Amino acid sequence: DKEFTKIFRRAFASRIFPPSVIEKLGISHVKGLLLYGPPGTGKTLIARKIGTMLNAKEPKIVNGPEILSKYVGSSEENIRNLFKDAEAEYRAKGEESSLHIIIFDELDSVFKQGVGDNVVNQLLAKMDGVDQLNNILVIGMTNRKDLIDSALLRPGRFEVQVEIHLPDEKGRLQIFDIQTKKMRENNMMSDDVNLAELAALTKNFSGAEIEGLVKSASSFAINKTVNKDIAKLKVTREDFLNALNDVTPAFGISEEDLKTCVEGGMMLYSERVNSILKNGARYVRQVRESDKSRLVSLLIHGPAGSGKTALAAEIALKSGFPFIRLISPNELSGMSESAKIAYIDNTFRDAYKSPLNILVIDSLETLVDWVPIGPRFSNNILQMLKVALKRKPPQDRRLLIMTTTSAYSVLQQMDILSCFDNEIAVPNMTNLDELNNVMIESNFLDDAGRVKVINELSRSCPNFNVGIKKTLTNIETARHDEDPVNELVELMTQSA
Amino acid sequence: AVIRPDFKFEDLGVGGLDKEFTKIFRRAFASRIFPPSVIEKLGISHVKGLLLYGPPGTGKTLIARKIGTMLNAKEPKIVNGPEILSKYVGSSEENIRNLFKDAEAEYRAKGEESSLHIIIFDELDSVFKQRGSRGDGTGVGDNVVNQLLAKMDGVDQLNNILVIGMTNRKDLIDSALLRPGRFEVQVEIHLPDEKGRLQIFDIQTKKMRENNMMSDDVNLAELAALTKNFSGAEIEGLVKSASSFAINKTVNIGKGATKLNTKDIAKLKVTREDFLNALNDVTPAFGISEEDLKTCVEGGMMLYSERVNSILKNGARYVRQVRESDKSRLVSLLIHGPAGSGKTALAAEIALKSGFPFIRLISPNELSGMSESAKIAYIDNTFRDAYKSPLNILVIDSLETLVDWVPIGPRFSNNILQMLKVALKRKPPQDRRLLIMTTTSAYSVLQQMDILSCFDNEIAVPNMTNLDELNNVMIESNFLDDAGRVKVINELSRSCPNFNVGIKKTLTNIETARHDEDPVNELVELMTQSA
Ligand SMILES: Nc1ncnc2c1ncn2[C@@H]1O[C@H](COP(=O)(O)OP(=O)(O)OP(=O)(O)O)[C@@H](O)[C@H]1O
Ligand SMILES: Nc1ncnc2c1ncn2[C@@H]1O[C@H](COP(=O)(O)OP(=O)(O)OP(=O)(O)O)[C@@H](O)[C@H]1O
Ligand SMILES: Nc1ncnc2c1ncn2[C@@H]1O[C@H](COP(=O)(O)OP(=O)(O)O)[C@@H](O)[C@H]1O
Numbered sequence A: 001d002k003e004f005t006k007i008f009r010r011a012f013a014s015r016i017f018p019p020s021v022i023e024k025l026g027i028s029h030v031k032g033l034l035l036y037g038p039p040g041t042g043k044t045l046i047a048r049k050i051g052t053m054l055n056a057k058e059p060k061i062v063n064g065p066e067i068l069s070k071y072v073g074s075s076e077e078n079i080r081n082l083f084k085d086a087e088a089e090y091r092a093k094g095e096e097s098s099l100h101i102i103i104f105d106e107l108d109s110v111f112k113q114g115v116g117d118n119v120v121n122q123l124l125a126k127m128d129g130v131d132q133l134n135n136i137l138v139i140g141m142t143n144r145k146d147l148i149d150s151a152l153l154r155p156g157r158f159e160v161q162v163e164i165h166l167p168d169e170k171g172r173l174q175i176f177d178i179q180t181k182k183m184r185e186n187n188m189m190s191d192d193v194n195l196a197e198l199a200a201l202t203k204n205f206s207g208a209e210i211e212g213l214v215k216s217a218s219s220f221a222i223n224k225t226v227n228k229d230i231a232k233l234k235v236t237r238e239d240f241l242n243a244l245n246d247v248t249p250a251f252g253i254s255e256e257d258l259k260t261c262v263e264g265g266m267m268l269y270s271e272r273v274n275s276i277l278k279n280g281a282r283y284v285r286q287v288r289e290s291d292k293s294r295l296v297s298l299l300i301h302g303p304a305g306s307g308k309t310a311l312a313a314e315i316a317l318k319s320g321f322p323f324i325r326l327i328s329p330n331e332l333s334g335m336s337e338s339a340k341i342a343y344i345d346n347t348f349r350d351a352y353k354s355p356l357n358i359l360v361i362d363s364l365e366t367l368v369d370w371v372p373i374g375p376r377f378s379n380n381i382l383q384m385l386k387v388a389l390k391r392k393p394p395q396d397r398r399l400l401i402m403t404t405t406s407a408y409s410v411l412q413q414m415d416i417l418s419c420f421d422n423e424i425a426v427p428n429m430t431n432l433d434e435l436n437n438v439m440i441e442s443n444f445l446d447d448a449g450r451v452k453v454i455n456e457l458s459r460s461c462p463n464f465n466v467g468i469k470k471t472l473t474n475i476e477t478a479r480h481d482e483d484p485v486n487e488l489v490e491l492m493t494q495s496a
Numbered sequence B: 001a002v003i004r005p006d007f008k009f010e011d012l013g014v015g016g017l018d019k020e021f022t023k024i025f026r027r028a029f030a031s032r033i034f035p036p037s038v039i040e041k042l043g044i045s046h047v048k049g050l051l052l053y054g055p056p057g058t059g060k061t062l063i064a065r066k067i068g069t070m071l072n073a074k075e076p077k078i079v080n081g082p083e084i085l086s087k088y089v090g091s092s093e094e095n096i097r098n099l100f101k102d103a104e105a106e107y108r109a110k111g112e113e114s115s116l117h118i119i120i121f122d123e124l125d126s127v128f129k130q131r132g133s134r135g136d137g138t139g140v141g142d143n144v145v146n147q148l149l150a151k152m153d154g155v156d157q158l159n160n161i162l163v164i165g166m167t168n169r170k171d172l173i174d175s176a177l178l179r180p181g182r183f184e185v186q187v188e189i190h191l192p193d194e195k196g197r198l199q200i201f202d203i204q205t206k207k208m209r210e211n212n213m214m215s216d217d218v219n220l221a222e223l224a225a226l227t228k229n230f231s232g233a234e235i236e237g238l239v240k241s242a243s244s245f246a247i248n249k250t251v252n253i254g255k256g257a258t259k260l261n262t263k264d265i266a267k268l269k270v271t272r273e274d275f276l277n278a279l280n281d282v283t284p285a286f287g288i289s290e291e292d293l294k295t296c297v298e299g300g301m302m303l304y305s306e307r308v309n310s311i312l313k314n315g316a317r318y319v320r321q322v323r324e325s326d327k328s329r330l331v332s333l334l335i336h337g338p339a340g341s342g343k344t345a346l347a348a349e350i351a352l353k354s355g356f357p358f359i360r361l362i363s364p365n366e367l368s369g370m371s372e373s374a375k376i377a378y379i380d381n382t383f384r385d386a387y388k389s390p391l392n393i394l395v396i397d398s399l400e401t402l403v404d405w406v407p408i409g410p411r412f413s414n415n416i417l418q419m420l421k422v423a424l425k426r427k428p429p430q431d432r433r434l435l436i437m438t439t440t441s442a443y444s445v446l447q448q449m450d451i452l453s454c455f456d457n458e459i460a461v462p463n464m465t466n467l468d469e470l471n472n473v474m475i476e477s478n479f480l481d482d483a484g485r486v487k488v489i490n491e492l493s494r495s496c497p498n499f500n501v502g503i504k505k506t507l508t509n510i511e512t513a514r515h516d517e518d519p520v521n522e523l524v525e526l527m528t529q530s531a
Helices: A001-011 A019-025 A043-053 A074-083 A083-091 A115-129 A169-185 A195-201 A205-226 A236-245 A254-258 A271-289 A309-319 A337-352 A381-389 A408-416 A432-441 A447-458 A469-481 A485-496 B019-032 B034-041 B058-072 B091-096 B101-113 B141-154 B192-212 B220-226 B234-245 B274-281 B294-295 B306-324 B344-354 B372-386 B416-424 B443-449 B467-477 B484-493 B503-515 B522-531
Strands: A032-036 A061-062 A100-105 A136-142 A160-165 A295-300 A323-327 A357-362 A398-405 A422-425 B049-053 B076-081 B117-123 B161-167 B185-188 B331-335 B356-361 B392-396 B434-442 B455-458
Touching: A032 A043, A043 A100, A043 A136, A074 A083, A074 A115, A074 A398, A074 B058, A074 B372, A083 A100, A169 A195, A169 A205, A169 B034, A205 A236, A205 A469, A205 B019, A254 A309, A254 A323, A271 A295, A271 A309, A271 A357, A271 A398, A295 A447, A309 A323, A309 A357, A309 A398, A323 A337, A323 B294, A323 B443, A337 A357, A432 A447, A432 A469, A469 A485, A469 B049, A469 B306, B049 B058, B058 B117, B058 B161, B091 B141, B161 B434, B192 B234, B220 B503, B234 B274, B294 B356, B306 B331, B344 B356, B344 B392, B344 B434, B356 B372, B372 B416, B467 B484, B484 B522, B503 B522
Parallel strands: A032 A136, A032 A160, A061 A100, A100 A136, A295 A398, A295 A422, A323 A357, A357 A398, B049 B161, B049 B185, B076 B117, B117 B161, B331 B434, B331 B455, B356 B392, B392 B434
Antiparallel strands: none
16 A cells, blocks of 8 residues: 555656646656566556556557567567557647556566567657657566666666565455355355465465465365265365475575574573573563664673573564574575675665564674684675674664674684673583483483482582583483483483 | 276386376366366366476386377377477468367367367477577577467367476476466376386286296396386386397307207296396496495405494494484484594495485595585585485595695685585484484594584594404405414514504405415515504
8 A cells, every 4th residue: 555655646646737737847757667576466467457547548468478579670560559549649639648558568578688679779769759758658567677678777767666565464365265255155165174274374375376275175075086975075174284285385484493493492400591581581672662772782602512592592582573583504505605795685684674673693603614723714704794783773673683602712812792782601501400400301210210310420420511402412312222320321421 | 088987007007106197187187077067166277287207218108108098088199399390481380270170179069068188299398498598590489389378378268178298307398388377287207116116027027927938936026126226118128138148048149150949949938147147237327326335345344353343233223213213313423543444344334234215425536526616516415415315324434535634734625624514413304314424534633623513422443453353354364274374373472462553454465465475474574564
């Protein structure tokens, strides 16, 4: 609706005025409008509806690829022939000519940077200069904006750019109702099926995909019958659930990546965990509330393997903000440097389009390509990050940044520590009490073994000092060989 | 109607691809089983386009050939790709829109009662390439796509046509035809599994076994086991190649004249060794692995000491763990020790005994000669491949050499190192498991790299030192007689009791002493200098 208001208010206001005033002042009316967006947004639908809603002349619909002509010079003949009606109508009357609209589906197909050049020549010739036809509106629609010929991308031509987006939640439910009507009405639908959950499953689907899913879900019911009881042909939930495997989108999401990081779960083996969580909650409310603190930076540092990614991910999931994202070395693997810089800069720029945002950075030093014998590292990306972490967002938008590291000293060498506002230390557990909590939580052994393990450990290793991750993997591997204590204690004593 | 009442698919040649047959039947002809009234009542349209594709020689042409006779279908119209084109202007286009008249006439004639007309385009990619190729020439290579596209999308309500297009390379197809309403369903045909392999052998050897022309000795199960990566075409080639051997025993081609033993013509019979010779003749074209690991342990084991046994037991323990638990989806192990002690053979042996579906090794041998980017890409593709099968074992050989370490700079390739560092910590996709074994000889260097933190457990392989183990390996190698093996050890006991060599050097010295002078004066001499 916002685009609907913008295009109407700004572009289509000058036609409203009495023609003599326009003729006399010399105000020049906007000629070119570019609708763009991903496939399936319905650019053709909006292009059709714009003509009808403005009470304009009947649109001339022509396909982009169909412009290609067999005969030499006939493509130019067609292009010039397109304008004859509008030219003659303006000649007869002038300012009183009605609004002619021409839509060229898939403009980029033929308008790339030699039929495809002579068409551009003819269009540009008829379009500007000798002609002052303000009664013609040409609407260009393309899925790929970068392919547009640069000869047309200039002021005066396609001044106004408007974008489009896929079907959101309610609209998807409504279209689902539209397709399902015929099948639901005829009492061949089991009441067990809920349409809203099928929307909840289909997040990145376009209408054609929806039709495909409908056919496949009906199809499993088809198969159930065929290896005269046709009355019992009913479409059930299970067919819909099964048919989801066939169709596939072309989208991507990283919210899942933040949910898998905490797969191992929390254990609250110590109070300091709760203290850290409290501090994180305090900082998120602080960003939420204060209108001046528009940028907050936090460091999470500690011994390797103590467990730092999971904590930040948990805090971020607890925040409940609209926009959440993670940057990790995993995504960047295999890329060249010039690509990694651009990827990082993208991930920063896309975060400035929402009132409240949280970003998490994983294993900073690993991104920086650090190795100590040289010491060797990539300076460019380091600089990129250093600049980026001090950028204030645009007005009225707020960021919360957490980065995790394990090489505090190296960062100290780099003098980058001035970038940050506050540090949090996460020490690994050292007291056998926490081992007991972890042990009961993991239901490793009965009470007796869990009492004997502590006794055994007390007489060999008082200061325990191992990361939680190691403890978990040690428990898992000790589960199999010899569940009794005669494995486990030895293993930790080796890993002490 | 749409399938013959007398049919069960058991009789047909196609075997080993049964899931694909059910998918095609369910998604293609299912909607044309009921009376028409139901479909409109349900508001479902019919499917129009099909695509089949796979590597060369997988059986697609066999399907396309037999389906017409299979399902009581109107004789499908077969046109190979490059014949649609013609010399004269407009001839190709009219040729394309010359196929659809009969079905369309029947459609106007008889509405929805019209029977099903099937036309199959062998070799779809030949003419329907990308329609933005460019070239500034005769445009007949584009308007054909437009003609088919017009007659297939703007069909004017023709709903009784199914086109089946077969190809070997989807990528070359013009993208304009891969969209809903136009070749919606795509079916992949991949290489057969083992059971389908046996099916194919059985189908091929039917007529053979019926006419008592095969010896009872032959065992199909063994053959199916042997042919690791053979497609159906390669199997047929194997069959006839094995036959040629039996054929070439009575007729002695070239040598002598034509001597046909008319009696043995009736006793012609194939035997197992002929099949073995045939296996040696034909080779597959896919390969991947399962040979490099076997050759990596060619020298075999000797079990000269308990240490070998203990290490093997530990490896068995670990493979059991990764096989059983579902929470442990990734395990990494290091094998380190003195140079030449013998590390690679042990890991290969463990992997071979594991018997998992999926195994490969990475060695400097393969990567030789490539540019850095190529090496990065190669490793990445190998890893990405490993993330596929449910269970996976991967072996990494001589890590230091993969990273190009030389101690004078010290110079090394950082990119490869850091790529490996990130990669060895990557948990595979959901519900997949992976087991990594890496071997090295320069522990301290790795420690300086500070990359020691992504290894769950480390295994030492001390070289042998006690003269007993030397006697064991020597008796196994059969270097000399009994008295010789005794006297040499008695001499070595006092010549140099303290002893540190390894394993490889020992075998080398044994062979050299065998060649020149298997007396003491060579073997003991060299053994003494080496230690
Ligand atoms: N309070 C806690 N603090 C840290 N880890 C915890 C806590 N409670 C539970 N865990 C568990 O500790 C495990 C070990 O941490 P994790 O697997 O994230 O390794 P890590 O230390 O982040 O790795 P890295 O060495 O790269 O920093 C987590 O998988 C998580 O399930
Ligand atoms: N128990 C054993 N342990 C190791 N090798 C054995 C054993 N029994 C027999 N062998 C033989 O010893 C040889 C070991 O050589 P291998 O190539 O593994 O040495 P390596 O140390 O890996 O080589 P490099 O020094 O180049 O790294 C093989 O021929 C193997 O068959
Ligand atoms: N189930 C099968 N799978 C693969 N090939 C088979 C099978 N049964 C028989 N064959 C033999 O393999 C060949 C089929 O190859 P074909 O499909 O023509 O390869 P292409 O993929 O190049 O079309 C025929 O010679 C046929 O006799």
